[PDB]
Amino acid sequence: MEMEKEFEQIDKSGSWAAIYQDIRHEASDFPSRVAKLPKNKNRNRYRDVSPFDHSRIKLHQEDNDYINASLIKMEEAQRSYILTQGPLPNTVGHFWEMVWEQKSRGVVMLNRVMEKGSLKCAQYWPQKEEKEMIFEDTNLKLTLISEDIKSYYTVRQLELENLTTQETREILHFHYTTWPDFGVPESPASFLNFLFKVRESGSLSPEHGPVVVHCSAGIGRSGTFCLADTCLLLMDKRKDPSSVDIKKVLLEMRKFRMGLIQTADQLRFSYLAVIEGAKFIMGD
Ligand SMILES: OCc1cc(C(F)(F)F)ccc1N1CCOCC1
């Protein structure tokens, strides 16, 4: 069923809350035993948001390999994403260790450091060229190279150095700065423009490690970003683009991380983004 018609049918009937609860009920439940070990309590931002054991990213160290991060592997679309929480004061070194070890080119940030008057993630990147950051626990150095500030997003060029080998890599930081403190954006235009920019950078392409995507919990806005990207890629690859079922794609992604899409309004926004996006895809 063409999703645009499914959309108008749900909107006219006002059943968004009903559809959303059906997804919640059918979603996968897999063990997260490593996340719940007492040694890992200060590595989790939220008690109710944990990576599944089968899909968690492992840090390459013998001490403690745990980070709150999941590998989302979309077999038909040929895309992989790492979805993670906003880093905590004691996990900023783990975060950059993961980017290094997984060979990521891009980090996608969908939150502000402060929202609703509270801290939603650590200040984990340098704000001035001449004041670099050193992570002594993981032996990394991070330098701000350049910053491009636009109305709806900021792009940063960062240099990450493995202090052990003196190898360096260029990381691109894509920061969406205008998601509202409450609800979802009224139009998906600026969100789609932003995805367009991440794609154009090479950050989502198979010659690199998976993109790292985060918000505060790494399930809501983060969920919306990967769901929209994968649905648009499938509409490009298939003979019958109308066969793309956004609810079935979301349930496939929920095999790899719990809780993706946190509200009925985020579900409606994801539909709106894909419907508008495909327009820009089908010759326009
Ligand atoms: O050509 C497709 C396209 C065009 C634009 C445009 F028109 F603004 F230039 C923006 C985004 C996209 N992609 C990426 C995510 O959103 C939908 C698909």
mmCIF file of C-alpha atoms in Angstrom, residues 3-282:
data_model
loop_
_atom_site.group_PDB
_atom_site.id
_atom_site.type_symbol
_atom_site.label_atom_id
_atom_site.label_comp_id
_atom_site.label_asym_id
_atom_site.label_seq_id
_atom_site.Cartn_x
_atom_site.Cartn_y
_atom_site.Cartn_z
ATOM 1 C CA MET A 3 2.712 4.860 2.202
ATOM 2 C CA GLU A 4 1.340 8.378 1.207
ATOM 3 C CA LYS A 5 -2.233 6.878 1.211
ATOM 4 C CA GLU A 6 -1.529 4.787 4.371
ATOM 5 C CA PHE A 7 -0.396 8.220 5.821
ATOM 6 C CA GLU A 8 -3.634 10.146 4.996
ATOM 7 C CA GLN A 9 -5.721 7.092 6.223
ATOM 8 C CA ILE A 10 -3.891 7.122 9.665
ATOM 9 C CA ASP A 11 -4.058 10.996 9.884
ATOM 10 C CA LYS A 12 -7.799 11.230 9.005
ATOM 11 C CA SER A 13 -8.539 8.369 11.501
ATOM 12 C CA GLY A 14 -6.045 9.855 14.071
ATOM 13 C CA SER A 15 -4.659 6.336 14.870
ATOM 14 C CA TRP A 16 -0.891 7.222 15.221
ATOM 15 C CA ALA A 17 -0.853 6.077 18.913
ATOM 16 C CA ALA A 18 -2.522 2.754 17.898
ATOM 17 C CA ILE A 19 -0.010 1.981 15.047
ATOM 18 C CA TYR A 20 2.922 2.913 17.388
ATOM 19 C CA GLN A 21 1.745 0.581 20.196
ATOM 20 C CA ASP A 22 1.397 -2.315 17.625
ATOM 21 C CA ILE A 23 5.136 -1.823 16.731
ATOM 22 C CA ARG A 24 6.056 -1.729 20.479
ATOM 23 C CA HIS A 25 4.143 -5.049 20.984
ATOM 24 C CA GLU A 26 5.730 -6.928 17.978
ATOM 25 C CA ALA A 27 9.341 -5.641 18.594
ATOM 26 C CA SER A 28 12.175 -8.136 19.318
ATOM 27 C CA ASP A 29 13.333 -8.884 22.897
ATOM 28 C CA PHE A 30 16.923 -10.203 23.161
ATOM 29 C CA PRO A 31 19.201 -10.366 26.246
ATOM 30 C CA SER A 32 21.354 -7.340 27.322
ATOM 31 C CA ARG A 33 23.307 -9.151 30.116
ATOM 32 C CA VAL A 34 26.679 -7.336 29.602
ATOM 33 C CA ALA A 35 24.948 -3.841 29.854
ATOM 34 C CA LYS A 36 23.435 -4.829 33.273
ATOM 35 C CA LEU A 37 26.725 -6.047 34.948
ATOM 36 C CA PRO A 38 27.411 -3.907 38.055
ATOM 37 C CA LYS A 39 30.912 -2.896 36.715
ATOM 38 C CA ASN A 40 29.035 -1.095 33.789
ATOM 39 C CA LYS A 41 26.501 1.020 35.731
ATOM 40 C CA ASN A 42 28.411 4.321 35.160
ATOM 41 C CA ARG A 43 28.750 3.467 31.368
ATOM 42 C CA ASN A 44 24.935 3.767 30.823
ATOM 43 C CA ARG A 45 23.110 7.093 30.613
ATOM 44 C CA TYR A 46 19.604 5.548 31.041
ATOM 45 C CA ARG A 47 18.739 2.391 33.065
ATOM 46 C CA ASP A 48 16.030 1.370 30.487
ATOM 47 C CA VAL A 49 18.198 1.773 27.237
ATOM 48 C CA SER A 50 20.787 -1.007 26.692
ATOM 49 C CA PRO A 51 22.438 -2.642 23.675
ATOM 50 C CA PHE A 52 21.518 -6.320 22.993
ATOM 51 C CA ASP A 53 24.421 -8.733 23.587
ATOM 52 C CA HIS A 54 24.257 -10.160 20.002
ATOM 53 C CA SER A 55 24.713 -6.721 18.253
ATOM 54 C CA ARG A 56 26.720 -4.636 20.815
ATOM 55 C CA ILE A 57 29.981 -2.956 19.722
ATOM 56 C CA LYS A 58 33.014 -4.374 21.581
ATOM 57 C CA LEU A 59 35.961 -2.138 22.572
ATOM 58 C CA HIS A 60 39.368 -3.781 21.662
ATOM 59 C CA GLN A 61 40.718 -4.028 25.239
ATOM 60 C CA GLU A 62 40.995 -6.912 27.755
ATOM 61 C CA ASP A 63 40.067 -4.784 30.861
ATOM 62 C CA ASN A 64 36.382 -3.957 30.012
ATOM 63 C CA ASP A 65 35.083 -4.139 26.373
ATOM 64 C CA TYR A 66 31.692 -2.502 27.147
ATOM 65 C CA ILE A 67 30.130 0.621 25.474
ATOM 66 C CA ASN A 68 26.449 1.495 25.097
ATOM 67 C CA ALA A 69 26.460 1.156 21.234
ATOM 68 C CA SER A 70 24.826 -1.242 18.674
ATOM 69 C CA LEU A 71 25.613 -2.312 15.043
ATOM 70 C CA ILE A 72 22.472 -1.950 12.846
ATOM 71 C CA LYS A 73 23.220 -4.087 9.664
ATOM 72 C CA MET A 74 20.614 -3.583 6.846
ATOM 73 C CA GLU A 75 21.243 -6.549 4.471
ATOM 74 C CA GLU A 76 18.991 -5.577 1.488
ATOM 75 C CA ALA A 77 19.838 -1.824 1.598
ATOM 76 C CA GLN A 78 23.630 -2.632 1.976
ATOM 77 C CA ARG A 79 24.006 0.030 4.772
ATOM 78 C CA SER A 80 25.439 -0.333 8.333
ATOM 79 C CA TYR A 81 25.088 2.214 11.206
ATOM 80 C CA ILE A 82 26.425 2.321 14.771
ATOM 81 C CA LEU A 83 23.762 3.846 17.080
ATOM 82 C CA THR A 84 25.080 5.022 20.497
ATOM 83 C CA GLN A 85 24.055 7.190 23.511
ATOM 84 C CA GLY A 86 25.455 10.701 23.955
ATOM 85 C CA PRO A 87 28.832 10.157 25.656
ATOM 86 C CA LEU A 88 29.123 10.576 29.475
ATOM 87 C CA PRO A 89 32.005 12.268 31.340
ATOM 88 C CA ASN A 90 33.595 8.865 32.001
ATOM 89 C CA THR A 91 32.941 7.396 28.438
ATOM 90 C CA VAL A 92 34.287 10.177 26.133
ATOM 91 C CA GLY A 93 37.588 8.192 25.739
ATOM 92 C CA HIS A 94 35.635 4.940 24.977
ATOM 93 C CA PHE A 95 33.558 6.858 22.348
ATOM 94 C CA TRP A 96 36.680 7.986 20.375
ATOM 95 C CA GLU A 97 38.303 4.502 20.822
ATOM 96 C CA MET A 98 35.183 3.030 19.098
ATOM 97 C CA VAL A 99 35.332 5.565 16.191
ATOM 98 C CA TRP A 100 39.066 4.642 15.750
ATOM 99 C CA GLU A 101 38.609 0.817 16.002
ATOM 100 C CA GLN A 102 35.498 0.672 13.711
ATOM 101 C CA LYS A 103 37.160 2.918 10.982
ATOM 102 C CA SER A 104 34.257 5.363 10.905
ATOM 103 C CA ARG A 105 34.599 8.499 8.682
ATOM 104 C CA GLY A 106 31.570 10.416 10.120
ATOM 105 C CA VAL A 107 29.853 11.163 13.500
ATOM 106 C CA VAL A 108 26.211 12.359 13.294
ATOM 107 C CA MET A 109 24.970 14.335 16.413
ATOM 108 C CA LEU A 110 21.184 15.099 16.591
ATOM 109 C CA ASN A 111 21.057 16.864 20.030
ATOM 110 C CA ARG A 112 22.455 19.975 21.766
ATOM 111 C CA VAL A 113 24.816 19.513 24.762
ATOM 112 C CA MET A 114 22.172 21.315 26.906
ATOM 113 C CA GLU A 115 18.389 20.926 26.255
ATOM 114 C CA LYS A 116 15.440 21.642 28.631
ATOM 115 C CA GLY A 117 18.054 23.180 31.068
ATOM 116 C CA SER A 118 19.877 19.819 31.669
ATOM 117 C CA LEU A 119 23.003 18.201 30.210
ATOM 118 C CA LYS A 120 22.117 15.683 27.413
ATOM 119 C CA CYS A 121 25.783 14.701 26.596
ATOM 120 C CA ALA A 122 29.395 15.596 27.472
ATOM 121 C CA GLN A 123 31.289 18.331 25.538
ATOM 122 C CA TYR A 124 33.283 15.540 23.761
ATOM 123 C CA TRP A 125 34.979 17.568 20.929
ATOM 124 C CA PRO A 126 37.250 20.709 21.058
ATOM 125 C CA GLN A 127 35.681 24.142 20.457
ATOM 126 C CA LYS A 128 38.944 25.996 19.527
ATOM 127 C CA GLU A 129 41.721 25.036 17.099
ATOM 128 C CA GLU A 130 44.527 25.837 19.563
ATOM 129 C CA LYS A 131 42.956 23.876 22.528
ATOM 130 C CA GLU A 132 43.113 20.178 21.514
ATOM 131 C CA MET A 133 41.747 17.324 23.733
ATOM 132 C CA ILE A 134 43.761 14.351 24.998
ATOM 133 C CA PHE A 135 41.944 11.152 26.265
ATOM 134 C CA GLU A 136 44.627 9.573 28.532
ATOM 135 C CA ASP A 137 42.576 6.397 29.332
ATOM 136 C CA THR A 138 42.477 5.395 25.529
ATOM 137 C CA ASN A 139 45.683 7.224 24.274
ATOM 138 C CA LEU A 140 43.935 9.478 21.647
ATOM 139 C CA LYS A 141 44.316 13.164 20.653
ATOM 140 C CA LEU A 142 41.512 15.135 18.955
ATOM 141 C CA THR A 143 42.023 18.570 17.226
ATOM 142 C CA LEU A 144 39.474 20.933 15.687
ATOM 143 C CA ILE A 145 40.627 21.631 12.048
ATOM 144 C CA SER A 146 37.703 23.775 10.738
ATOM 145 C CA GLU A 147 34.038 24.548 11.493
ATOM 146 C CA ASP A 148 31.240 25.542 8.980
ATOM 147 C CA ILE A 149 28.199 27.000 10.903
ATOM 148 C CA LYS A 150 24.895 27.070 8.917
ATOM 149 C CA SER A 151 21.335 27.955 9.990
ATOM 150 C CA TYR A 152 20.134 24.351 10.706
ATOM 151 C CA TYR A 153 23.453 22.404 11.166
ATOM 152 C CA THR A 154 27.227 22.741 11.687
ATOM 153 C CA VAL A 155 29.915 20.616 9.957
ATOM 154 C CA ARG A 156 33.301 20.210 11.630
ATOM 155 C CA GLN A 157 36.582 18.727 10.359
ATOM 156 C CA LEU A 158 38.419 16.898 13.222
ATOM 157 C CA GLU A 159 41.842 15.172 13.341
ATOM 158 C CA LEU A 160 41.971 11.998 15.476
ATOM 159 C CA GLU A 161 45.473 10.722 16.354
ATOM 160 C CA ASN A 162 46.254 7.290 17.794
ATOM 161 C CA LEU A 163 49.087 8.391 20.171
ATOM 162 C CA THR A 164 50.353 4.737 20.271
ATOM 163 C CA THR A 165 51.164 4.546 16.462
ATOM 164 C CA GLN A 166 51.113 8.306 15.519
ATOM 165 C CA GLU A 167 48.590 7.425 12.754
ATOM 166 C CA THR A 168 46.011 10.214 12.089
ATOM 167 C CA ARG A 169 42.617 10.266 10.350
ATOM 168 C CA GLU A 170 40.173 12.962 9.319
ATOM 169 C CA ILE A 171 36.713 12.584 11.024
ATOM 170 C CA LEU A 172 33.730 14.662 9.839
ATOM 171 C CA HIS A 173 31.279 15.835 12.611
ATOM 172 C CA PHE A 174 27.698 16.475 11.303
ATOM 173 C CA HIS A 175 25.787 18.397 14.034
ATOM 174 C CA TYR A 176 22.017 18.962 13.531
ATOM 175 C CA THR A 177 21.442 21.917 15.954
ATOM 176 C CA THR A 178 17.710 22.868 15.484
ATOM 177 C CA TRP A 179 15.659 19.814 16.607
ATOM 178 C CA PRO A 180 13.125 21.436 19.037
ATOM 179 C CA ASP A 181 13.327 20.781 22.838
ATOM 180 C CA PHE A 182 9.668 19.347 22.648
ATOM 181 C CA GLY A 183 7.982 17.384 19.806
ATOM 182 C CA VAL A 184 9.353 17.021 16.191
ATOM 183 C CA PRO A 185 10.079 19.608 13.439
ATOM 184 C CA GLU A 186 6.959 20.952 11.615
ATOM 185 C CA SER A 187 8.563 20.321 8.134
ATOM 186 C CA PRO A 188 11.156 17.571 7.330
ATOM 187 C CA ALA A 189 12.864 19.826 4.753
ATOM 188 C CA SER A 190 15.856 20.840 6.920
ATOM 189 C CA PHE A 191 16.318 17.223 8.288
ATOM 190 C CA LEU A 192 16.353 15.802 4.666
ATOM 191 C CA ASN A 193 18.800 18.587 3.570
ATOM 192 C CA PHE A 194 21.043 17.432 6.483
ATOM 193 C CA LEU A 195 20.882 13.687 5.518
ATOM 194 C CA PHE A 196 21.682 14.773 1.892
ATOM 195 C CA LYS A 197 24.868 16.479 3.283
ATOM 196 C CA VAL A 198 25.991 13.424 5.297
ATOM 197 C CA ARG A 199 25.495 11.178 2.205
ATOM 198 C CA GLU A 200 27.430 13.594 -0.078
ATOM 199 C CA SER A 201 30.437 13.431 2.336
ATOM 200 C CA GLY A 202 31.140 9.681 1.783
ATOM 201 C CA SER A 203 30.469 8.998 5.517
ATOM 202 C CA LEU A 204 27.676 6.417 4.745
ATOM 203 C CA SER A 205 29.581 4.641 1.965
ATOM 204 C CA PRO A 206 30.980 1.073 2.073
ATOM 205 C CA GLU A 207 34.623 2.128 1.673
ATOM 206 C CA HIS A 208 34.497 3.398 5.349
ATOM 207 C CA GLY A 209 33.500 1.801 8.677
ATOM 208 C CA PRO A 210 29.865 2.433 9.766
ATOM 209 C CA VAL A 211 28.771 6.020 10.559
ATOM 210 C CA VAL A 212 28.386 6.681 14.358
ATOM 211 C CA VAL A 213 24.921 8.216 15.059
ATOM 212 C CA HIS A 214 23.806 9.593 18.470
ATOM 213 C CA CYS A 215 21.288 11.762 20.310
ATOM 214 C CA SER A 216 20.867 11.602 24.126
ATOM 215 C CA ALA A 217 19.689 7.910 24.423
ATOM 216 C CA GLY A 218 20.609 6.924 20.817
ATOM 217 C CA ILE A 219 17.113 5.500 19.943
ATOM 218 C CA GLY A 220 14.685 8.367 19.143
ATOM 219 C CA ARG A 221 16.108 11.059 16.794
ATOM 220 C CA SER A 222 18.921 8.532 15.983
ATOM 221 C CA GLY A 223 16.199 5.981 14.983
ATOM 222 C CA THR A 224 14.544 8.573 12.705
ATOM 223 C CA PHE A 225 17.838 9.303 10.850
ATOM 224 C CA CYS A 226 18.684 5.598 9.999
ATOM 225 C CA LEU A 227 15.006 4.652 9.227
ATOM 226 C CA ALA A 228 14.628 7.555 6.725
ATOM 227 C CA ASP A 229 18.024 6.859 5.036
ATOM 228 C CA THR A 230 17.369 3.040 4.649
ATOM 229 C CA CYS A 231 13.758 3.539 3.369
ATOM 230 C CA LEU A 232 14.910 6.072 0.664
ATOM 231 C CA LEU A 233 17.800 3.746 -0.403
ATOM 232 C CA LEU A 234 15.315 0.801 -0.773
ATOM 233 C CA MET A 235 12.919 3.008 -2.876
ATOM 234 C CA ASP A 236 15.944 3.692 -5.244
ATOM 235 C CA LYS A 237 16.998 -0.029 -5.529
ATOM 236 C CA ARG A 238 13.502 -1.649 -6.072
ATOM 237 C CA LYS A 239 11.368 -1.879 -9.300
ATOM 238 C CA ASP A 240 8.176 -1.226 -7.212
ATOM 239 C CA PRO A 241 9.187 1.597 -4.804
ATOM 240 C CA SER A 242 5.578 1.375 -3.442
ATOM 241 C CA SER A 243 6.588 -2.072 -1.904
ATOM 242 C CA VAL A 244 8.695 -0.254 0.798
ATOM 243 C CA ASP A 245 6.900 -0.862 4.138
ATOM 244 C CA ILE A 246 8.306 1.608 6.745
ATOM 245 C CA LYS A 247 6.769 -0.357 9.697
ATOM 246 C CA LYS A 248 8.495 -3.569 8.489
ATOM 247 C CA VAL A 249 11.864 -1.753 8.030
ATOM 248 C CA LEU A 250 11.561 -0.312 11.617
ATOM 249 C CA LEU A 251 10.850 -3.802 13.035
ATOM 250 C CA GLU A 252 13.937 -5.171 11.164
ATOM 251 C CA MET A 253 16.078 -2.338 12.711
ATOM 252 C CA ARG A 254 14.604 -3.133 16.214
ATOM 253 C CA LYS A 255 16.169 -6.619 15.931
ATOM 254 C CA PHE A 256 19.530 -4.762 16.466
ATOM 255 C CA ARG A 257 18.704 -2.016 19.068
ATOM 256 C CA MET A 258 15.685 -1.662 21.386
ATOM 257 C CA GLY A 259 13.274 1.282 21.360
ATOM 258 C CA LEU A 260 14.086 2.917 17.945
ATOM 259 C CA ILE A 261 11.447 5.702 17.425
ATOM 260 C CA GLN A 262 10.368 6.800 20.968
ATOM 261 C CA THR A 263 6.916 8.442 20.262
ATOM 262 C CA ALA A 264 3.913 8.336 17.842
ATOM 263 C CA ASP A 265 4.973 11.876 16.704
ATOM 264 C CA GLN A 266 8.518 10.582 15.761
ATOM 265 C CA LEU A 267 6.784 7.727 13.771
ATOM 266 C CA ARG A 268 4.603 10.282 11.858
ATOM 267 C CA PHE A 269 7.656 12.552 11.247
ATOM 268 C CA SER A 270 9.591 9.502 9.793
ATOM 269 C CA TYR A 271 6.681 8.830 7.347
ATOM 270 C CA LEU A 272 6.636 12.562 6.373
ATOM 271 C CA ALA A 273 10.423 12.603 5.791
ATOM 272 C CA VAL A 274 10.368 9.473 3.529
ATOM 273 C CA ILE A 275 7.292 10.713 1.531
ATOM 274 C CA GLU A 276 8.947 14.135 0.930
ATOM 275 C CA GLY A 277 12.424 12.570 0.403
ATOM 276 C CA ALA A 278 11.314 10.147 -2.385
ATOM 277 C CA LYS A 279 9.885 13.221 -4.228
ATOM 278 C CA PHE A 280 13.515 14.586 -4.359
ATOM 279 C CA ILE A 281 14.488 10.991 -5.484
ATOM 280 C CA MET A 282 11.869 10.209 -8.242
#
